[PDB]
Amino acid sequence: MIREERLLKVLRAPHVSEKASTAMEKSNTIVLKVAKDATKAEIKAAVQKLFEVEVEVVNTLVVKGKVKRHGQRIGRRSDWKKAYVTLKE
Amino acid sequence: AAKIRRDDEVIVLTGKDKGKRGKVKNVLSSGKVIVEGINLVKKHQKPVPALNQPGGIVEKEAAIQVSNVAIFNAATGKADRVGFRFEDGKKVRFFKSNSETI
Amino acid sequence: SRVCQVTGKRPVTGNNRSHALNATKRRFLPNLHSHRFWVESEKRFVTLRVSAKGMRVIDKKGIDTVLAELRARGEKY
Amino acid sequence: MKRTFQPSVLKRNRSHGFRARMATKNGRQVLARRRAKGRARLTVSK
Amino acid sequence: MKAKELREKSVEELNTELLNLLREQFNLRMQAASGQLQQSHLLKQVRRDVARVKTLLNEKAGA
RNA sequence: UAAGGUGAUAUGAACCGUUAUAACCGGCGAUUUCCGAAUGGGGAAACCCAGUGUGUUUCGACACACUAUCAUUAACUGAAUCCAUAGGUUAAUGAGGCGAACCGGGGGAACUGAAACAUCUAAGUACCCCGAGGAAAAGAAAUCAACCGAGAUUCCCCCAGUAGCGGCGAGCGAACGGGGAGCAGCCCAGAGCCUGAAUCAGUGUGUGUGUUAGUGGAAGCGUCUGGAAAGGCGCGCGAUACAGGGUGACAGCCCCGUACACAAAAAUGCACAUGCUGUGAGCUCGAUGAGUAGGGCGGGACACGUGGUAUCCUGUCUGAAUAUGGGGGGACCAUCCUCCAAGGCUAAAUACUCCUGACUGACCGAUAGUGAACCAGUACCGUGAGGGAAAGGCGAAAAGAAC
RNA sequence: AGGACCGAACCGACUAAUGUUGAAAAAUUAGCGGAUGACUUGUGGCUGGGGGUGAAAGGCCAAUCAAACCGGGAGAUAGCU
RNA sequence: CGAAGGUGUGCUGUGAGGCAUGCUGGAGGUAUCAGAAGUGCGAAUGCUGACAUAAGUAACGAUAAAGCGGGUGAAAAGCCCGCUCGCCGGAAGACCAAGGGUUCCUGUCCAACGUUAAUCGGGGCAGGGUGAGUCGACCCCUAAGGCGAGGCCGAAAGGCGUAGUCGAUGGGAAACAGGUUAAUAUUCCUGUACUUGGUGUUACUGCGAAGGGGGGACGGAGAAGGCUAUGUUGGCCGGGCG
RNA sequence: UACGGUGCUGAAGCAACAAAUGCCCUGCUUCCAGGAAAAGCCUCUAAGCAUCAGGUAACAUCAAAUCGUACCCCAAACCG
Incomplete structure (x- = not known):
């Protein structure tokens, strides 16, 4: 079918920062940069398919891009999506 | 289609190095050629700490124009001009004033 | 429109034009x-917005031919 | 003093937005003029 | 890869090579964003690789 | 085609290549997210929400497709109402929107001039709207002419600032005729002698010339100044090539080219020979465009402002003869002359340039030339329609100044 | 009960002073009027230029009004500077 | 072995001008005789750029108000910390809507910006931060009103309008307390809950709409009663004994 | 102790009075100026269906998607 093509196309990167690492250590939660559309069902299916780990719930958000000044020009960065995936215990 | 190719030996016609011959190493898209060991510049290279950090005044070879070079012959011993001749299907270069293939 | x-x-x-x-x-x-x-060939009344010279045209050549022309050009009635 | 511009994005998009200009014929001519001039912001939509 | 080895392949063998290229691209960009992958060019080539497969899949399955 | 490349600011890293499926260019294919005529419904554009159907299912769901309105046609149904329409449903085909100028039509100003102004002019101009094409419209004499004739329409130069029109003011202003560019004539209103007849559109085929990548393309060295030679000086060669650009100063002979000779697997536009689909062609017999021509009224166009104003067009009311007939010949009548209205189609000469290609300039050279040589319809101003800048130059080469 | 009374929020704008190249292209300060109504306010609609709307001043219609603003006739016209 | 340009000097013509030359510049200039002009500026409250003048003058934006110690630094009235002082407290406090759009937090820099300095910042640069079945939107439903298949009207554009379909400023299910980050929390975590659908079984049983009825579903003012939010005092508990 | 603050235990946790402009109260009285609509919700049936389908009731289960969530918000962040 075409489901596994979508599941491989959803995930982009794991996010890395202090809040991501602290949520991983305490709350058993991985933070992922996902696709822009990327619903919670597609994210949960993709993590359970491509990391072979069981997944409890997904909280997503859309991070807005910051207007950066380069020389004299102004460029708004990409709007991307972030997913806090809570695994099992 | 390029007369002066990469592993050639050419003699410089005009410049601070008129007459000095040498090997080509790099031709650029600009219509310029780096000839090995003629057009030397003293670049005041800055040391970069977040890399290997040499610094120092470095001799580089500057780009020379392709019209300033001409292919050395070592049959007549002077600069010659290069033409394009059609043998069996590959296009070859041929020397002028002696119709010989490079 | 008034057609x-x-x-x-x-x-x-x-x-x-005035007097000046x-x-x-x-x-x-x-x-x-x-x-x-009244249309005998359809046995019914057709309501048309006609001029008085249009009624003289219908009174000269009959309504079966004028409705044929309206059928021809693509207007409805 | 209360000034002449008191903003609201709903009245903005309902009066000067793209669908409002694309409704009427003169607004489509306004869009045609904005395209022929070559403007980068066609309407005020965002 | 090249065109002709894929041009001799079946439809469903092209499909499993498509899925293999998708898994390969997934692992590659995971290694790229993680801090691995000194050799970035693989990313680009695997991208064009998938396009090659998909092009033949639009010729072989029907057009 | 090719030994180099992975677009630019712009490096860098990691790589792909070199006798040929690296890159690059050209033809044809594939992909083509969402908005936009936006076409499934809606909407504050780039969003929200579906329906029906088919198949992939680990049953939580996915995927593909279709679903706008209008017009034409066909088929099912089907009211008051009996039949039948109206209406409802499905199918197939077309249209929709955008674009610089040109073209035709439906409307349509005023500033201004008249040294005020109202008729007039400006002006059928601007502007609005509708429609089509590569051109469009007009077009085959119910025309002009003058008792001699010319032979459809369009454009140019005269006639001619002429006759005329005109508060006879301001102004507007022909035609006849002549010289040219370009040439083309037909079909229906109907029957019989026939069915590929003189031919056009729609498909293939062959050739030629084009277009879309490209290939070959001649012949100069020494010496002095110089940062650097292409300059000066000296001695040679090419030239169907001394057009142009670049190369460290001014190059025919250093490079790219130019004159010249060539080059297409595939797509092609053009005109040539032929094979089908439809349509007839060639003869005699007849017909030969009715609410029409003309009239009364009110307006408009004709250069012609109602004037003695012919001619054309209509809003209104009327209303013939019909080839023993009818129109026109500038009030009108008679005689002659000339043509046949109320049905159509038609190429070239002509107008225009968003864009593409080459070339030119007693055109401009950064306050100029486009508003914009520069990441410009941008920053900025305005709710909005809309307005709208300034801003080029190191060097031959970054050798862009280590310490 | 009240287009009742006193008086905060709220709405207004009577007087004075300051400001007058302001802190502000209409304000501040101290007093002032209404403050259960013909009140006031948020949000969204509708009316558009010889037009709207006007408890009527030629007032207001985006700091513009005895006819807005933008673009076009248009380089209007100017016996005047 | 040095053009146009720029800048001095000296000759020369009745004048507009001309010629030579020193310095800078570093690549073009152009006789003579003809030809054409975007052909000569001091003025137009001329247009654009630059720079003066008033002049180191006014002013530095509420008369709520600061003082000191230590830090950090090259530099401290202004930043950080601490002690006092003063100002608001129906706000000059704490939440949101509208509207902005990253201004939020951390590290770092002081050219510009801040009417002064700045080590500071709502500034520059980089990194991080917005977690929802219950909150708001989306969604169901309508008001004013918009669009509007057909339709009716209109030179054309278009106007109005029925069926419909939008339109919140209104009506419609569901979550609280505590803890946590430098930055989120009714969203994360802990504890305890709630709502609406789809699917499966088990029983009883008539279900069914676009239609009928109820309900949703409503004004100003006034007065009293029951209460709570909240506050004050006592009791209790921990500390003090100045 | 990074000196900012993190880690563990943690007593009582009651009564009386006062009290709203908030809740009962979309109530009650009164007046004239006579005070939205539709759906969710409840109920009735018509066409239809009646082994079922559907409904009621209990239980198990799965789903609740998408968008906003920072910060200012009587203000140095909106309009001037």
């Missing part, structure tokens, strides 16, 4: 009248 179904008369423009020749833009409207014609 006869048979003849196709539309309001044209023109001038109110002061022109004013005016309209010439057709003498349009919504009339019901």
